Amino acid sequence: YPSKETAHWKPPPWNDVDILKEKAVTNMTLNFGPQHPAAHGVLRLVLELSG
Amino acid sequence: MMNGRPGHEPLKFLPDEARSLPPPKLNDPRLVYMGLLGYCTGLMDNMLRMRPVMRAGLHRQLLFVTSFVFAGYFYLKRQNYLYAVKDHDMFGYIKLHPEDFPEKEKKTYAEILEPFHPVR
Amino acid sequence: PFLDIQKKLGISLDRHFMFLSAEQPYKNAARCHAFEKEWIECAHGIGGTRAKKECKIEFDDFEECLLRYKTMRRMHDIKKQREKLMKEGKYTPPPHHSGREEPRP
Amino acid sequence: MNPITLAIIYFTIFLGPVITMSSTNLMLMWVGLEFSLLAIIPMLINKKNPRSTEAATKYFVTQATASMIILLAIVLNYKQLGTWMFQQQTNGLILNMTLMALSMKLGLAPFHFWLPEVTQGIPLHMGLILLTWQKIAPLSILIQIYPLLNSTIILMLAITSIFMGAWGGLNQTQMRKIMAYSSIAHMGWMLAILPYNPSLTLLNLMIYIILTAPMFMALMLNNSMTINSISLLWNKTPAMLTMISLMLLSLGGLPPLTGFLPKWIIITELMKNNCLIMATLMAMMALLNLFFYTRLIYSTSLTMFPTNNNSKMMTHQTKTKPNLMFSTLAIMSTMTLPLAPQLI
Amino acid sequence: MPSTFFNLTMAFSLSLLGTLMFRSHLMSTLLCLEGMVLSLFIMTSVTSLNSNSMSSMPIPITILVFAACEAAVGLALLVKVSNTYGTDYVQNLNLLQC
Amino acid sequence: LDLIWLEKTIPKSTSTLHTNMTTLTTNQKGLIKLYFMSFLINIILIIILYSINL
Amino acid sequence: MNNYIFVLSSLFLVGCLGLALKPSPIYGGLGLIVSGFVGCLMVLGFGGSFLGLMVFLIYLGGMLVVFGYTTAMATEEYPETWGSNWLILGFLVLGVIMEVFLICVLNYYDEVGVINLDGLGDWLMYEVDDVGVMLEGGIGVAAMYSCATWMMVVAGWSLFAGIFIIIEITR
Amino acid sequence: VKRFFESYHEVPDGTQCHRKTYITTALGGICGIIGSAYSVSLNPADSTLEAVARVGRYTFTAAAIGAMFGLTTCVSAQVREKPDDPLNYFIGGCAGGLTLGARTHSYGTAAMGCVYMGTAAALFKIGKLEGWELFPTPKV
Amino acid sequence: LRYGLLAAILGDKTTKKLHEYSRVITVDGNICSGKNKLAKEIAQQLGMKHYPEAGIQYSSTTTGDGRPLDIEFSGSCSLEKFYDDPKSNDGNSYRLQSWLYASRLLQYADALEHLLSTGQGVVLERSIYSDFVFLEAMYNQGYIRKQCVDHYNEIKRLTLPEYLPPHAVIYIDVPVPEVQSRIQKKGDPHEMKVTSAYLQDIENAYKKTFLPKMSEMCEVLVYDSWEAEDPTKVVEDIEYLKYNKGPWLKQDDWTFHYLRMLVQDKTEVLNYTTIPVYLPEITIGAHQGSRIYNSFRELPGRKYAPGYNAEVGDKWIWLK
Ligand SMILES: Nc1ncnc2c1ncn2[C@@H]1O[C@H](COP(=O)(O)OP(=O)(O)OP(=O)(O)O)[C@@H](O)[C@H]1O
């Protein structure tokens, strides 16, 4: 029974698996920078981390 | 409500008090009705699995009938024992508390006067 | 209960630490052991609706041992009257209530 | 899943309620409820999709608060009387808080907004368990304390469950929600009479189980979750229409089927205690509960719908799904009215 | 004793009001459940020590056991919520109505 | 009478009433926040009812 | 030193209040730790040592994992502590005001029975056994191995099955 | 206080029109507040001002229902002196339904609510008169 | 016994059966490239079993008497009619396309059932992972409307993830004039009357979509016609493959168990093809559908389960 609110209710899928807006893999960006002692003084070494 | 009855043994199917009750005949109408239930159950199990009806599982139908009757006999013995327990407690209670159930006796239609309601 | 299996088997998995007066580890009486024992022994054979009116004195005694309200109210009344007298200049406490006594033993 | 994990989880689900029955300590009853809670979730969430995650989260968050409220009630009772059992002469506030928490556990209205969602977000199995095996122990708690309960809000919760279940199931195309609203209405029928002769509560519970389980199996046999999916049943499994019809017309209580027996004897034992007009209201809204069952069996049985071209492969291939208990549970239902004195 | 028991009851009531009144996050709700657990523990233990009922002293430990199991599975479902939606918020679990 | 008014009074009034109450009842959005707020309202009303009745 | 227990109870109340206002799980878990410490202290005040210490240990171990997870899942760019919202600050201050006002009210509506400010510290311990030994908590809790060997079984099974439950939820 | 709403029945209809009137009005306002709470928790508004407007609308509506119901009841008992007559409650329920159709601009709702509220109120008076007990205690 | 958890525990696992040539392998290409000749020889040389392409009549051949059925039981579609009248209002095109998708699905299922049970490798050609090629060909021309493509992609979304991909695909290409020449030299009046645009859309769909997205999961072995010939070279290349970069590496005994139970039930396989998306080109209507169902159950070998049919010669039916 289509109300004014429920007009936008698209039905569900059949297998109960929705198609989603896939989130971005927004990893953490770190500067393993030049001042770092493991760096030899002059190495920036940008790196992406998943943890 | 009778679970607090005295002598109520817990999770006991047939107390020895039930052994004084007359058992069913084994020709009883509801027992053959349960056999009919089992027969129809076998027939439905055949119809659901695309097998011939009345022709396929004559061991399954016999098994269903036996199960239904062999359970209904004892369940009915239990239920008869329970109704007997009900009536026993009730008669004992009216015997214990007669004042609340007075020995009433009623008049005749000659002495009492109900009103007449003409149809007309 | 619903499925009285423990009675059907005789075991006691949990029905031996239901109430206070039940077998503490080393035999240390829980307080109001006597009152709970008395209430439970009056309410036995009876069930419920009749024990709720034929063992009400014992339940009241137990409720006053456990939650202990009437003694609170009594000492409150006493302290109230004492404060009133001491503010009226009528009552002075004795030596063994201001912290100056001869300890007994 | 692997076999050891399944054994562990199903054994825990069996022991939750079985602990909740054979336990005088209310704390151990709470323990059993928590077992059921903790062990059902891996199977609500076995498919690992957003619907399953949401269903499991809603179930957990709704059941944990009710568990904590029941524990509040138990702790207050222990403080009051120094005992882990609801005696008489406790506090009505304690008992009512307990009853409201258990209502939230079952799904009774106005605490019902979580059950259709959760039942929608999970497979056909684990809706069966959720609606049958998880209603029992919560009912056991009430069954053990039926004289202590308030006759007022017990009946308000009942009536609200009936009204809301009927008006919810009226407009649902998804069957996993229709069965949930049916559960809500039937739990209303149970809890109305629970302070009056509690054996009839167990009667209605067993009837409801024996109806719903075959129905969920019927939906399993083709993974039916929609009216338009159960309507394509005269082409796939056309020997199930009879039993589905009789069991839906049992769920909506009609006389010759045993689903009218619970409503009938419940109205009887309520009229014995002058609960006349509330019983009349419930009996009359059960018809609105029946209307969508009638529409459903119209859609699938009496006015056979359009089918597809790909459904002929299903005709070629064979099935093994009916488990030999579909027939038994559907035939003990729909045909066991004359055995009613042996049921009560 | 009666004063602190009243205050513990009111603390449980506040934690209950919290876990009922949601915000965007979920772990805050789980923390409210933990606070309810803590208050009930304290009330049970205080009663056992007041009444000197040592036989009931195993009860708060069982409460902690099962409550931390509840927190464990809630945290597992939290992991799942994050893996799906990425943001832990509760207002995204709104696709079962359809 | 037969085709309009006895259809408007007895059957169609019933149908409109029940489908309207169905609409305003079951048109929820699956948010735990709103459901739990309603649960709070129910708790409040029941403790109020107890406080009044006693 | 008689209002000790009322002070501890009121601090527990305030902690659970600031918890219920639901700031970031960092400050929320800080409130949990404060309230668990306070609960341990009052259980000690009623003569209970082991139970309080175990409260503190278990809640510390839990809040550690809570920090680990909230840094991973329940984090915002602006975690929204208490004072960040004038509204939440107002609810906190109003809760403290209503605590004070309601305690003053219950100190008047009844002489004693709900809250006793004049009689306070007189009712804590209730019939101590002034001569005793093997009397503390720890004996009762150790009765899980003797005279309460069902609680141990059922909790052990809870944890054992919880392991499998967690593995399958995370799988 | 339960006594305040039980004082509706200490003197019969046709007497103390004002007392019964704003008793019933308070009752209707209570029920309207409940309805507003359920309508704002579930299905909220786009703003707290819209929500408060909804609450006031519901509440004053139900208050009007109750006010007209009580007024009409005690009037039709004052006129045509017959306090033990559920037709007065029927007429009052019809006035309530017509007010529901006024505040909610619909004649269909007006007649619907008239019939339903009138039958309900007549049944209420029959219950108060014959000794019907909603929410009975278990006796058997 | 029927397979299940009990048999799995008893020790009919799957990883104990796979040795080296327990491999799904699909041979793909355009209309006439030599896939039957190639697949048959691959199966001869490696020990696999050749599954021919899954036409309209596969559920008929793998069921009952193994004979073809009338065109109204095993579909209602024809490929000849599709060639000589593709833009018919009667939606023969998508009816055919969806029927062949379902038949390829059942083919893949039976293939896995043989693999996971016996361990024997399986050869295929033009599986469900390459059946959209003819669909996009139909849609680039005016042979079908877009709603049918949506139906197709939805059913693929429902069915495809539940199955594992092939370890390798063998796509043999021919230029469009050469396949058209091999068609004109094939001797079929219905295939002769096909456009080069259809075949070019097929080639483009293959080379653009099917090759890469399966190279993310399979070992592509693109060959040409003069390498399609000399099939021993293809087999020799197959034997020395490093079968990496696939989901088959993250499958233990229980993944195999649940896949093999999904595949044991063919209605569990075909449920998402019977969905009530009411397209005019797939719907059949109650009268026609009932007529067909009754005529089908009025056939010999049908009307009951397989073993329960005395009209064939089955016996001991009264003790089953
Ligand atoms: N999914 C489909 N859609 C439309 N038509 C198809 C589909 N699958 C097969 N066909 C048709 O069936 C015929 C199959 O020929 P196929 O490519 O199988 O030849 P073959 O048997 O491999 O031998 P050769 O390759 O040597 O011709 C083609 O004419 C093609 O048009």
User: How many CA atoms lie within 13 Å of D23's alpha carbon, on the beta-carbon side?
Assistant: 23
I153 phi and psi, to 5 degrees? -70, -35
Contact between B45 and D327 under an 8 Å Cβ cutoff? The reply is: yes
Letter for the amino acid at H10?
E
Best mutation target among D14, D22, D140, D143 (most C Cβ atoms within 10 Å) is D22
Q: Which is the closest atom of ligand 1 to the Cα of I30? A: 17
Domain ranges of chain E: 2-98
Residue I26 Cβ contacting ligand 1 at under 6 Å: no
What percentage of chain F's residues is helix, strand, coil (to nearest 5)?
80, 0, 20
* Distance linking the first and last C-alpha atoms of chain A: 49
Q: In whole angstroms, what is the distance from residue D202 CA to residue D102 CA? A: 16
3-state DSSP assignment of residue B11: coil
Q: Vertex G69, ends G65 and G72: CA angle to 5°?
A: 150
SS3 track for chain I: CCCCHHHHHHCCCCCCCCCCCCCEEEEEECCCCCHHHHHHHHHHHHCCEECCCCCCCCCCCCCCCCCCCCCCCCCCCCHHHHHHCCCCCCCHHHHHHHHHHHHHHHHHHHHHHHHHHHCCCEEECCCHHHCHHHHHHHHHCCCCCHHHHHHHHHHHHHHHHHCCCCCEEEEEECCHHHHHHHHHCCCCHHHHCCCHHHHHHHHHHHHHHHHHHHHCCCEECCEEHHHHCCHHHHHHHHHCCCCCCCHHHHCCHHHHHHHHHHHHCHHHHHHHHCCCCCCCCCECCHHHHHHHHHHHHCCCCCCCCCCCCCCCCCCCHHHC
Q: In whole angstroms, what is the distance from residue A7 CA to residue A1 CA? A: 9
Q: In whole angstroms, what is the distance from residue I102 CA to residue I81 CA? A: 20
Tell which phi-psi region holds residue H131, choosing left (phi > 0), alpha (psi between -120 and 50) or beta.
Answer: left
3-state DSSP assignment of residue E53: coil
Report which DSSP code applies to D83: B
Q: Does I9 touch chain A (CB under 8 A)?
A: no
The residues, ordered by sequence, that sit 6+ positions from B101 with a Cβ below 8 Å of its Cβ are: B94
| Record: contact C66-D18, CB cut-off 8 A | no
The residues, ordered by sequence, that sit 6+ positions from I255 with a Cβ below 8 Å of its Cβ are: none
Q: In whole angstroms, what is the distance from residue F42 CA to residue D113 CA? A: 13
The range of the structural domain enclosing residue D23 comes to: 2-344
Residue E30 distance to chain F (closest CA, Å):
14
Residue I191 Cβ contacting ligand 1 at under 6 Å: yes
The Å distance, Cα D339 to ligand 1 centre, comes to 64
Question: String of b and e for D299-330 (b: at least 16 CB within 10 Å)?
Answer: bbbeebbbbbbbbbbbbbbebeebeeebbbbb
Q: Give the residue, out of I134, I140, I180, with the most ligand 1 atoms within 8 A of its beta carbon, to mutate for a pocket test.
A: I134
Q: In whole angstroms, what is the distance from residue D185 CA to residue D287 CA? A: 11
Report which DSSP code applies to A30: E
* Partner residue facing D327 (CB), from B1, B48, B79: B48
CA nearest neighbour of D108 among D163, D167, D60: D163
3-state DSSP assignment of residue D6: helix
In whole angstroms, how far apart are CA B113 and each of B107, B108, B117, B119, G8?
11, 10, 13, 19, 81
Tokens of I170: 């063998």
From start to end of chain C, where are the E strands?
none
The residues, ordered by sequence, that sit 6+ positions from C24 with a Cβ below 8 Å of its Cβ are: C30, E52, E53, E54, E55, G140
Instruction: Burial-class residue I141 by CB neighbours within 10 Å (0-12, 13-18, 19+).
Output: middle
| Record: contact C22-E55, CB cut-off 8 A | yes
Helix axes D92-106, D151-169, angle to 10 degrees: 20
| Record: contact E97-A9, CB cut-off 8 A | yes
In this structure, the dihedral spanned by the alpha carbons of residues E45, E50, E56 and E62, taken in order and rounded to 10 degrees, is 0
Best mutation target among D308, D315, D320, D323 (most I Cβ atoms within 10 Å) is D308
In whole angstroms, how far apart are CA I208 and each of F18, F51, G56, I202, I211?
56, 74, 63, 10, 7
Question: What is the secondary structure of B24-77 as a DSSP string?
Answer: P-SS-HHHHHHHHHHHHHHHHHHHHTT--TTTS-HHHHHHHHHHHHHHHHHHHH
Technique employed here was cryo-EM
Q: Does D316 touch chain B (CB under 8 A)?
A: no
What percentage of chain D's residues is helix, strand, coil (to nearest 5)?
70, 0, 30
Residue G17 distance to chain C (closest CA, Å):
28
Helix axes D136-144, D199-220, angle to 10 degrees: 180
3-state DSSP assignment of residue D85: coil
Tokens of G62: 């839990």
Inside any domain, residue B70: yes
Q: In whole angstroms, what is the distance from residue I279 CA to residue I98 CA? A: 12
The residues, ordered by sequence, that sit 6+ positions from D160 with a Cβ below 8 Å of its Cβ are: D108, D109, D110, D188
Tokens of D340: 């009613």
Which stretch of DSSP H or E encloses residue A48? strand A46-49
Map tokens 């009745």 to a residue: F53
Residue I36 Cβ contacting ligand 1 at under 6 Å: yes
* Nearest Cα residue in chain A from D173: A11
Q: Is the dihedral of CA H107, H108, H110, H115 positive or negative?
A: positive
Contact between G118 and G124 under an 8 Å Cβ cutoff? The reply is: no
Q: In whole angstroms, what is the distance from residue C20 CA to residue E52 CA? A: 8
Tokens of B106: 């009623």
SS3 track for D69-80: HHHHHHHHHHHH
| Record: contact D310-I98, CB cut-off 8 A | yes
- Beta-carbon count within 10 A of I92 CB: 22
What is the CATH class of E2-98?
mainly alpha
Which stretch of DSSP H or E encloses residue D188? helix D175-193
The residues, ordered by sequence, that sit 6+ positions from G52 with a Cβ below 8 Å of its Cβ are: E45, G39, G40, G41, G42, G43, G44
In whole angstroms, how far apart are CA G102 and each of E13, F35, G97, G114?
15, 29, 8, 11
Q: Vertex I247, ends I241 and I248: CA angle to 5°?
A: 60
How many domains is chain D built from?
A: 1
In whole angstroms, how far apart are CA D227 and each of B16, D235, I271?
54, 15, 15
Q: In whole angstroms, what is the distance from residue H65 CA to residue H59 CA? A: 10
Q: Is the dihedral of CA D179, D183, D189, D190 positive or negative?
A: positive
In whole angstroms, how far apart are CA C49 and each of C52, C54, C59, D81, D148?
5, 9, 14, 18, 11
Helix axes I231-239, I35-46, angle to 10 degrees: 50
Q: In whole angstroms, what is the distance from residue I128 CA to residue D226 CA? A: 27
Partners of residue H41 in chain F, C-beta under 8 Å: 34, 37-38, 41
Q: In whole angstroms, what is the distance from residue A14 CA to residue I272 CA? A: 8
Tokens of G25: 């799980």
Tokens of E92: 């995204």
* Partner residue facing D68 (CB), from E36, E74, E96: E36
Q: In whole angstroms, what is the distance from residue D98 CA to residue D75 CA? A: 11
Q: In whole angstroms, what is the distance from residue F6 CA to residue F12 CA? A: 9
Question: Any bridge partners for residue I173, and if so which?
Answer: I224
How many domains is chain B built from?
A: 1
- Beta-carbon count within 10 A of D42 CB: 26
User: How many CA atoms lie within 13 Å of D69's alpha carbon, on the beta-carbon side?
Assistant: 28
* Nearest Cα residue in chain I from D309: I282
Residue I34 Cβ contacting ligand 1 at under 6 Å: yes
Q: In whole angstroms, what is the distance from residue D286 CA to residue C40 CA? A: 46
Instruction: Burial-class residue F52 by CB neighbours within 10 Å (0-12, 13-18, 19+).
Output: exposed
Q: Is the dihedral of CA H38, H43, H48, H51 positive or negative?
A: negative
Q: In whole angstroms, what is the distance from residue D52 CA to residue D259 CA? A: 32
| Record: contact D78-E37, CB cut-off 8 A | no
Partners of residue D230 in chain I, C-beta under 8 Å: none
Q: In whole angstroms, what is the distance from residue E31 CA to residue D212 CA? A: 37
Letter for the amino acid at C97?
H
Q: In whole angstroms, what is the distance from residue B40 CA to residue B68 CA? A: 11
Instruction: Burial-class residue G91 by CB neighbours within 10 Å (0-12, 13-18, 19+).
Output: middle
Residue nearest ligand 1's atom 30 by CA: I31
Best mutation target among F17, F27, F34 (most A Cβ atoms within 10 Å) is F27
C–E touching, 3+ CB–CB pairs within 8 Å: yes
CA nearest neighbour of H70 among H123, H19, H139, H132: H19
* Interface subset of D 146-175, CB within 8 angstroms of B: none
Partners of residue G32 in chain E, C-beta under 8 Å: 31, 34-35, 38
Q: In whole angstroms, what is the distance from residue E98 CA to residue D231 CA? A: 20
Instruction: Give the length of chain D.
Output: 344
